[PDB]
Amino acid sequence: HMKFRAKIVDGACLNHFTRISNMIAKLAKTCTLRISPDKLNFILCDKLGGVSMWCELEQENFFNEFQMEGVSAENNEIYLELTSENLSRALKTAQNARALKIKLTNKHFPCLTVSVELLSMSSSSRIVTHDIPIKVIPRKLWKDLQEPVVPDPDVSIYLPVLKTMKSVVEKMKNISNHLVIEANLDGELNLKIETELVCVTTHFKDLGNPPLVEHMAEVHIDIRKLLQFLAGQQVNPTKALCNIVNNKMVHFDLLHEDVSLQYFIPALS
Amino acid sequence: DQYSLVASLDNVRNLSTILKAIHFREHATCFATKNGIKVTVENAKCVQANAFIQAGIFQEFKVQEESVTFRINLTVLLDCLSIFGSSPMPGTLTALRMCYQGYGYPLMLFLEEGGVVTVCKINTQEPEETLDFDFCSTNVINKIILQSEGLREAFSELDMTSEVLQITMSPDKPYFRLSTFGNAGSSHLDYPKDSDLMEAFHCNQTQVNRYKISLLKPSTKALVLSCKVSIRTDNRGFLSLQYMIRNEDGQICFVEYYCCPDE
Amino acid sequence: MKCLVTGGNVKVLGKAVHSLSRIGDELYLEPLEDGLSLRTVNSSRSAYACFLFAPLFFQQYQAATPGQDLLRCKILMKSFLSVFRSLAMLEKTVEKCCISLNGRSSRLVVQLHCKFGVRKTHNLSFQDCESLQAVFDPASCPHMLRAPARVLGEAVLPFSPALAEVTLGIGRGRRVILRSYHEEADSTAKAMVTEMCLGEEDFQQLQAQEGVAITFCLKEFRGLLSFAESANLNLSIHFDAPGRPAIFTIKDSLLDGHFVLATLS
């Protein structure tokens, strides 16, 4: 008898959650929500181009009420697959919300039901209810929903202003969908596209590197995936790190307001 | 430094904006001379759009020959010129340094914003036959100049359904008339010669010419950025539209549209 | 027939048309004694809309046209909508709008008198026809509701702009319920359902039996809502049982509007 029931009564929290939801709705059409006693993770392990995304929330930073029971005491977790825009559309009016309730239900079929109690001046407030269709993922499939292992990065560099990067890759994408991203321990990072009739290279410098030769570590990637990740970030993150594994993968590690986001983009072909 | 052409701008927008006014073809021909740069795009013998940026607009501008010409992909060119975004903020400029070594070499762009530097290598092509519409002020039957600002809304509401746009200019009423003839609909746009918008009116004969409207549609881009526009037709029936555009530094630049009549 | 509009009334006439273009493909026009009547109907004849602009809505209103006539005509909604397409260009540049017709004329003339002496003339073609009518009686409807359009606008906000049908129903405590409706089959791709439960105090009037519920076209309702919200007017809904039509009404001092929508059986 697995179950989940949570509530948010704090305005700032309700909005923070909503923003995070709008974000993953950008990074992936479909995602998996992992529920634990103290956390909530949004997971995308779509292997193709096997780009992965791992988002983690600390339940206590959002909910004033939180309760769940996994499949079994031993493995006290729950994995629900859902359509991202569904969760965003549900949080659509949370701007004028007094409270938010989320609860795993099974009326017509399994759903994550979200109830938004709108702000009111009387004793009776308007209520918006949304029944989000979810698919419970069986324990056997949980293995393919674990956060990717982080092989030590050849280079780990602080990322530049994301809005600026977005603009640049936005335009580069109009020229090619292949992109080379490179960086070094000297605080330099370059974005590069090369086609027969036009080449473009954007040089970022004085970026800094985290403690612990200056040849660069590079990696060829699908530009559309880099655009996706950047398009998702609504604001420049507190801590934003780019970790590259020469010719193998770029790994982004963001930490904005106690909410970490790990995006993984593998090399091409 | 054997560079046929070298140019610089503390503000790329003093170039990218004008170039966007004539961006309806993927390719354009660049013509540089001691006096400045002329970019031209053509639509197969029917339409020609030219943008001219006088050398005085640039901070650095030098040509090492009598004239230098080359063809480039305008779309890529504009994509690179706005590599840093299209919504810059006050006090946030993107500078440009253009370099074109010579025949057979790529156009090089160097842009920097906030210290970030973008390098662009845009291959050049062999120019092609560039149409010649010699709109001599001695061939001009009628000429008119309007205040661009108040024509934008109206001009964007031209029934694109009709395949043609008919222009009427005359010393008699109506003075200046644009007419369409679309799906079960005849429509007319009239501007009186004594209008506040009418800064100059010199029609000494009644002319009525037709043009395929879709050929004239792209002329809207230039209209939006201009502050003035003069309209002229000649004895052949060709249309000439000259747009006066003021850049961010108050300097003036012109865009010109020529269109053959429809028969 | 001659109708001359000025001031803000030009912009409101434009809105009425946009709002009408969201129901039917043909615009029916009847200059009546008590006002200009603009009507349209569904492509399936399941929706009916009508706006009646009282005489004082115009600066000059002359229903009768010289020559053997008593005008009743239909015009391509698209052609008429193009005239008022840009509510922006209206609000700003347009000062006067004059709609005219002669007995020996073949086209309907709409002439916008714009700033700086600019003038735009539209010659629309029309077809003489019979008065467009529908059958419905609000007075015999057992249930009705009345609330400011702004409020219903908020009631419909949670749903998707693309939602086709919606269910309106009365709950206990006199709570009004709006629920998204869909079709289809024990297949996957089950749709998310949204429900909005409104307080009783949100309605100026509510006379319906609990458990009562009807489903209708939201895309079409929104046509009347948009016009009503902007004009900040109250909206009434008169309905019966599933299968009978739902009647949506608004009433200003210079105009009347009715949208008669069908309900699933």
Ligand SMILES: OC[C@H]1O[C@@](CO)(O[C@H]2O[C@H](CO)[C@@H](O)[C@H](O)[C@H]2O)[C@@H](O)[C@@H]1O
């Ligand atoms: O008094 C209400 C009664 O009038 C009718 C019949 O005349 O409606 C007429 O007037 C409406 C506009 O007020 C038109 O939309 C309608 O087409 C016309 O018949 C009845 O329909 C209504 O119950």
